[PDB]
Design a protein around this motif. Structure first.
Motif, mmCIF file in Angstrom:
data_model
loop_
_atom_site.group_PDB
_atom_site.id
_atom_site.type_symbol
_atom_site.label_atom_id
_atom_site.label_comp_id
_atom_site.label_asym_id
_atom_site.label_seq_id
_atom_site.Cartn_x
_atom_site.Cartn_y
_atom_site.Cartn_z
ATOM 1 N N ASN A 191 42.668 39.582 42.789
ATOM 2 C CA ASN A 191 42.649 40.982 43.278
ATOM 3 C C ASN A 191 43.335 41.921 42.315
ATOM 4 O O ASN A 191 42.891 43.057 42.152
ATOM 5 N N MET B 19 34.930 37.938 43.237
ATOM 6 C CA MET B 19 35.008 38.313 44.669
ATOM 7 C C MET B 19 34.766 37.116 45.595
ATOM 8 O O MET B 19 35.488 36.927 46.588
ATOM 9 N N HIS C 105 38.311 48.242 41.949
ATOM 10 C CA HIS C 105 38.252 48.647 43.359
ATOM 11 C C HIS C 105 38.501 50.150 43.514
ATOM 12 O O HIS C 105 37.862 50.772 44.338
ATOM 13 N N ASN C 106 39.436 50.705 42.754
ATOM 14 C CA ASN C 106 39.750 52.149 42.790
ATOM 15 C C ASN C 106 38.784 53.003 42.001
ATOM 16 O O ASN C 106 38.230 53.986 42.533
ATOM 17 N N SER D 138 31.304 44.592 50.217
ATOM 18 C CA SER D 138 31.995 44.981 49.034
ATOM 19 C C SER D 138 31.102 45.824 48.083
ATOM 20 O O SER D 138 29.983 45.476 47.850
ATOM 21 N N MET E 177 41.695 45.305 40.763
ATOM 22 C CA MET E 177 42.167 46.489 41.526
ATOM 23 C C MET E 177 41.784 47.785 40.830
ATOM 24 O O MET E 177 41.347 48.718 41.482
ATOM 25 N N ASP F 153 36.497 48.348 52.685
ATOM 26 C CA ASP F 153 37.339 49.121 51.728
ATOM 27 C C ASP F 153 37.854 48.141 50.685
ATOM 28 O O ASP F 153 38.827 47.433 50.907
ATOM 29 N N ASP F 154 37.244 48.115 49.465
ATOM 30 C CA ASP F 154 37.563 47.030 48.532
ATOM 31 C C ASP F 154 39.046 47.008 48.197
ATOM 32 O O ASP F 154 39.624 45.932 48.055
ATOM 33 N N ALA F 155 39.655 48.186 47.977
ATOM 34 C CA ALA F 155 41.080 48.205 47.572
ATOM 35 C C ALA F 155 42.046 47.614 48.547
ATOM 36 O O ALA F 155 43.106 47.089 48.111
ATOM 37 N N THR G 256 32.621 46.443 44.853
ATOM 38 C CA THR G 256 33.052 45.712 43.686
ATOM 39 C C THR G 256 32.260 44.455 43.360
ATOM 40 O O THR G 256 32.004 44.144 42.172
#
Ligand SMILES: [K+]
Ligand SMILES: [K+]
Ligand SMILES: [K+]
Ligand SMILES: [K+]
Ligand SMILES: [K+]
Ligand SMILES: [K+]
Ligand SMILES: [K+]
Ligand SMILES: [K+]
Lengths: 292, 292, 292, 292
Positions: A233, A214, A240-241, A204, A237, A187-189, A206
């Motif tokens: 991060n 990363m 990620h979302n 990942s 972010m 879960d990248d987030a 992302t």
């Protein structure tokens, strides 16, 4: 390699939905140059759902050929029928892959005992390292820490890709398994938080478009430098979302096209082309990450 | 065709996990004698997840052969890749089935636009009537009423099996579709409520072992006799619940075996044999229904 | 003090439901001797729901009198009407409390803007430090990180008791607030994880019966010694869970009785006496913690 | 008494946040002229959360005075402490109200045994008819059918306002209680469905602004005219939904003001004024209903 930044690579396609070797080459070269630890071939992000086993094997073999020993490859090998998972696994025996990423059965909702028997049987019939994959939002079941504990006693079950986003799972699992069992975020987030709690890396989405950042984030995290990692991060972010603003891998394939890493953003139905509003959202996230 | 008590029939197996023709014949005879309206062959309860497409097709064809025109047969034809769903459906074109039960793609969590394109493409490659099937607990995706309305405009999309257990869906869907679009429950425990709100029948797990009672309940419902129907429903309610005490179809197979309807209760991994506690629970429910 | 192990203290009662001063004395002495950082008086665990404002104020004043300057006291001051929260707060102005613990309005489900206006108005009318309290499972609303960010700009809003158990909130909030804003867990089972991610302490139920071990766990966590802290957390984890086997503070009051720290385990309706099965579960957790 | 369209009436305020007698009179006259069956005074929509018990009682008494025997009045009497609920109920004994609407304790999350003792104690201290009110999204607790059955045995517990939106509750409860126990919807959007399943009426938000339409819908339902009722329901469905676009009663107060039913749309903090976007949404819903 099963620690650091591991990319769940897209399966780049031409306009007909067939694998584009030229695009895949370009991605693999990108990952080798950017310090990615390993490549997961035909995971969720690689459209495991819509490739048949022959096309799935071809993509794994092509990825191995193109990698040419420069980066380790892990194959997606999950199935919702234990016989089918065994069968698929056999296709990759002696292929050159370093391990397998094996998802909990989807749709049929097995018990915990059923998951234990499933994965135990798969492991029994290969010498390759197995990485369990829990993603309840997709599968309808949830592989719980107690069962992960039981399975980690099987010699070649070596870790888990934990994609619930529920960060309490890190230390619930850690306390039941040996120190050498690999805990990887799916879960990248929440992945930096997952590493800060004791996780060893991330598999990942992302990373397909922010491979270098990363790779550095995960190294800093492994070294304990969480404040430094968090700066990175924070820039990542929105991506990620927003790589999930429409169903994965619709956004990430469009992003790869926009950066020039793949020739086309084509996917297989029931995945559809990104919407105009999604293009705007993803673009904005890429710019926040400093990628465009 | 598509009203009344429709059984999602078990695929009875021998000890090796392959279809048992003698058992299938015994079940089909039972449903003919019982007043079951139609049989769904290789739906969820029929172990679609663990049969390969050849095996799945063999079971459908055997079921039609055995039905011998006495009872209509609807094939499960779902897949999470549009191409694969089209291929599966094509196996049955000109077979004798009366329609197809096609589940929303599982695992890949398509958008509503994706669901629309998936089912529209499948419908375009067949003349058979299509029943959509929504079961988000298993699939990770929820075919919403608006999209059902959109699809209901396609000539041969003619109904839905609504297995959310969310009874507000009945009139949400009914207001967006024509008077001849069929609304069927996929959730035995709420099905009588579902018919009370306007639905036309149920695709049932419980009807595997209480066929006569299910058909009598549904007839009473269609005639507006809800209080009489509810007495039957109350006798069956423990079975409606406890046939999911362990994952479907583990309990209903055991129950079939206990009643002498099938030779063995064997299933395919990752489904595992019923636990002792489960046997006792299902036994008690069968007793409550007057079946044992 | 707003870091370390802070106890959400029980309000010990006689058989008539009135505050027992002798029992409260014994608890306060226990906390002073065991290194607890502060006492939250008339929080959730202290039965804020069932004391009236006069009885609530009495308990806070009694706790201050008994503490006698040896340990800081924080008063519960929340309400679901902003006027009532202001009114209550005024009662404690110049009392000797060091701050207030103020829960999001319950039952009426205000918007984020409504929460922002509520807490801003409360802070405006006191000089005492305010600690926001988010507990969506009880209140029906969820104070989100963005709103916490806005509120942390108010001079005397100094921290949050975050009781969702959703560990992603730690760094979502941290990145929006200054380095001096206090992040405190309100969920004992996830509290060590919360500190490992950047939290500063815990407002704890478990601390009512394991004060010394909680105080050492939080110190070790603050120093970065998470593996050492986790050993302690492992011994306490059954208690962290089983103190909620029936509604809080039913189990913890029984535990305090069983250890001899309070004279009776009486609560006010609608809280009822612990069940026999709950007594067995709680006892077993106490023994696992080494407390009996 | 307790069938048909019952309005959960707003407590109209002046700009200072105190009850506006002229506005209350105008509303009550409107409900008399409209065919509303009864008025619930100081329920949720009446801002029970932000009135003190004196103010709450003043509003109930004023509402009865103004009703002048033309329309029955049910008082909100809930509290999350049993003692406080008994005190509040006692204020109305011999007042002229016809019964009480008593919500499950909020915030403290009692057990089902606790709910049983709470409501049994309240019922024992009055002769007034009691309507239980279950609204878990607001309270954090869910009064389950089994417990409703247990309570329905208490002479003066005579019905329930079921605001889960879970329509399976209608026949679950109905099977455990006597034929004269009243089942009322607390969820406007599902209420017609709720009556279709057996319920007896609705305690409605929407009836504040569509009283005539609500009463006509409910009459049609009681007579078994569901298709006619549904046409009315479809005209009201956007209001049923959009009166919760912002927290209740922010939108319904605005709507009352827009229609000329009340002088001001003022509420008490933490409820805040309607946003511009909310005004536009509710305006559109009123237009769709033919009210503007
Ligand atoms: K597939
Ligand atoms: K092996
Ligand atoms: K192992
Ligand atoms: K059609
Ligand atoms: K109270
Ligand atoms: K101030
Ligand atoms: K501040
Ligand atoms: K009664």
């Amino acid at each position: 390699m099963f620690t650091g930044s591991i990319v769940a690579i897209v399966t780049p396609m031409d306009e007909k939905g067939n694998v584009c070797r030229a695009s895949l080459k370009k991605l693999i070269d990108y990952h080798v140059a950017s310090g990615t630890s390993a490549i997961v071939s035909v995971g969720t992000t690689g459209e495991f759902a819509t490739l048949n086993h022959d096309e799935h094997a071809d993509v794994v073999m092509m990825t191995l050929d193109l990698a040419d020993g420069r980066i380790p490859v892990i194959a997606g090998t999950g199935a919702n029928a234990t016989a089918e998972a065994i069968s698929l696994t056999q296709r990759f025996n002696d292929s050159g892959i370093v391990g397998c990423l094996t998802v909990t059965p989807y749709y049929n909702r097995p018990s915990q005992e059923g998951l234990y028997q499933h994965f135990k049987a798969i492991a029994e019939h290969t010498d390759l390292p197995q990485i369990l994959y829990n993603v309840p939002s997709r599968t309808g079941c949830d592989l719980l820490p107690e069962t992960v504990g039981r399975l980690a006693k099987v010699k070649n079950i070596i870790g888990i890709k934990e994609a619930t986003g529920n960060l309490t799972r890190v230390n619930q699992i850690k306390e039941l398994v040996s120190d050498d069992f690999v805990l990887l975020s799916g879960d990248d987030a929440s992945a930096l938080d997952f590493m800060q709690l004791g996780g060893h890396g991330v598999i990942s989405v992302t990373a397909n478009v922010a491979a270098r950042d990363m790779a550095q984030m995960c190294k800093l995290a492994a070294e304990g430098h969480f404040a430094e990692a968090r700066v990175i991060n924070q820039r990542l972010m929105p991506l990620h979302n927003k790589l999930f603003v429409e169903p994965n891998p619709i956004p990430v394939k469009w992003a790869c096209k926009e950066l020039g890493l793949v020739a086309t953003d084509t996917l297989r139905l029931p995945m559809t082309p990104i919407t105009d509003s999604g293009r705007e959202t993803v673009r904005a996230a890429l710019k926040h990450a400093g990628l465009l």
